Design a protein around this nucleic acid. Sequence first.
RNA 1: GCUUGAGUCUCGUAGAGGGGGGUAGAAUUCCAGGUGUAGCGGUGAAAUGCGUAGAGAUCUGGAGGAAUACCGGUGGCGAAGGCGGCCCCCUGGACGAAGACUGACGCUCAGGUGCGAAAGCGUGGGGAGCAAACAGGAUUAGAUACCCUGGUAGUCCACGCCGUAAACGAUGUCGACUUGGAGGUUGUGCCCUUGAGGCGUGGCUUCCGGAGCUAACGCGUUAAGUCGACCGCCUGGGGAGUA
Lengths: 129, 55, 100, 51, 88
Amino acid sequence: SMQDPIADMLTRIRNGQAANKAAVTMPSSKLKVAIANVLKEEGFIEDFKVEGDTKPELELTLKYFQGKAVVESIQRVSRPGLRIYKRKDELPKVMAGLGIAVVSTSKGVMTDRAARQAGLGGEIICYVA
Amino acid sequence: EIDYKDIATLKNYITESGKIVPSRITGTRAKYQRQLARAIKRARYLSLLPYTDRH
Amino acid sequence: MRHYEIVFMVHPDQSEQVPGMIERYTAAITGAEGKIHRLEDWGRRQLAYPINKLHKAHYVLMNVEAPQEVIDELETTFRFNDAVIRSMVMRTKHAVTEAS
Amino acid sequence: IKVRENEPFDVALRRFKRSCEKAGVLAEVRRREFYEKPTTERKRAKASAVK
Amino acid sequence: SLSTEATAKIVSEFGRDANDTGSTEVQVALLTAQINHLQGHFAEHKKDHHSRRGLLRMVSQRRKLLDYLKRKDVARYTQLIERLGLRR
RNA sequence: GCUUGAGUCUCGUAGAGGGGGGUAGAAUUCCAGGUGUAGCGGUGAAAUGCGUAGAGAUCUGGAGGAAUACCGGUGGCGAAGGCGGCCCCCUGGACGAAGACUGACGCUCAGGUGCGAAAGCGUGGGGAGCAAACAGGAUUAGAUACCCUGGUAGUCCACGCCGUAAACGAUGUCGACUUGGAGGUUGUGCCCUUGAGGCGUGGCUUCCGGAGCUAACGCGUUAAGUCGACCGCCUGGGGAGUA
Ligand SMILES: [Mg+2]
Ligand SMILES: [Mg+2]
Ligand SMILES: [Mg+2]
Ligand SMILES: [Mg+2]
Ligand SMILES: [Mg+2]
Ligand SMILES: [Mg+2]
Ligand SMILES: [Mg+2]
Ligand SMILES: [Mg+2]
Ligand SMILES: [Mg+2]
Ligand SMILES: [Mg+2]
Ligand SMILES: [Mg+2]
Ligand SMILES: [Mg+2]
Ligand SMILES: [Mg+2]
Ligand SMILES: [Mg+2]
């Protein structure tokens, strides 16, 4: 039933945001991390944090610009039920460039901007603008 | 309440008629209005209290 | 071993068999190594309504700890026995003493 | 139900009858069975009695 | 719903020490135990349809836990059904 | 391999949850009798009906079946159906408090299986009241009705069929996330127990209401919001849930 953790992230964000909530926690995982990264790196959140050893715990800081939140739309794209895989030449580009698409390649979890540069393809985890 | 044998405490939870008295009058709690009835019933079966003012 | 409250009412004319009755039911319960945590020969008491015709009746309260077996036979002998015009073996939840 | 009412007063003084029986449980039992519809009937005795 | 006495005895009989309460093997026997008991309950009565649900439940459970063990340690598995007496 | 998902263990708590057996009081009908005397009963009004073989009314003693007033409550329990006197026996689930074991053993599920209101069917039983059918009396232009006097199946038990309901919250199951307010219910920690309490912390539930959603009505932390897993199902009305 907790069969898609990444959607639970994408959404814990999405909601917390719409609730002008500053913080946000959840159980962590290598995969969760690598994404929190791209989200920080590409600048949709302040910064992340994992507090614990036995039962690790991702913690994210939400950015808010004007009254609005910085994340206008976080949406899963692949998922358990129906997985997605674009090559390199068929990688998506969100909002015509603005915003981005997380994607996991054989060389780690990058953005579309990245993977295009990297010249390769992967599973398009989710979209974020 | 604590018991049916308490015909004493009991007799002030029924009308002249013998009819159990609503909780909305007694102000009794919930849990206890049940304990109460179930003990008045017991008292009634054991001829320790009338079902009726007919007797 | 389960406790029960228990209390029966003997017919007035058959009052005098109450001593032996208690004697009997006790030897019956203790017989199967069951304790007898209370006993109260309430004697002739007056009844709230008449029952079987006839008012007043001998009462006997009696809390006990005994197997669900001697409890059975008890319930039936209360039938076999005409002299007992009501009985009621009750709850349980640990012994009790004095009250009334 | 019952009234002693000893010496001084020929007034009935039985307003107790408007405290239980009468159109109480006697208008109730008087007719159509009901069965599950009292459920609905009493669901207005509270859809009202909320305020 | 199965005496503390007996329930304990079986933990003791199937798992490591008492306290190894949730050992696969032990649940299976703890259920098995109750299931079998219950046969006489539903012998008489039979119309007790509700309680019957709980019993079927018991078996859906055991059946699942048994399947799990088998995937783990088929050795522990075989021993178990010989020991309880089921599968035929 | 891990321990938080899920299980197991200890102790308790609430409960019309289920199955079996006993048992109570109030009423009705009926049988027998006391007293009593010409009406009762029924309607909108009537009549059929009942009463001088003494009715109804009243008192008493019986028999029988059916259902359990008050409690009783936007109270409670169950998966749905549905479950209300009281007691015992058998038994399912739920919940809470400690820690302890198992170590992903889970979620969903076509097919399959089980359950499943009332009516209905089969065999025996049972039968007070109610009541399709049917009979009589009225109403009405007509009255195969609504009303009245009767009343059979059935409504009751056992055993077995049937498998449907507006079987509805007309809202599939599970999981995570997202401002509040006033209750009801039911656990549990703490506090001069010094109050019939004070502050917490669970499960369940009723009423409002915010974002959000909605065609609108409305839903709104018990979602119809935000998201995922799986299943069922829809594709104009009639024809037809028929051939
Ligand atoms: Mg994963
Ligand atoms: Mg009678
Ligand atoms: Mg009589
Ligand atoms: Mg239980
Ligand atoms: Mg069936
Ligand atoms: Mg039927
Ligand atoms: Mg039949
Ligand atoms: Mg008729
Ligand atoms: Mg249908
Ligand atoms: Mg409904
Ligand atoms: Mg609220
Ligand atoms: Mg609302
Ligand atoms: Mg939803
Ligand atoms: Mg057809």
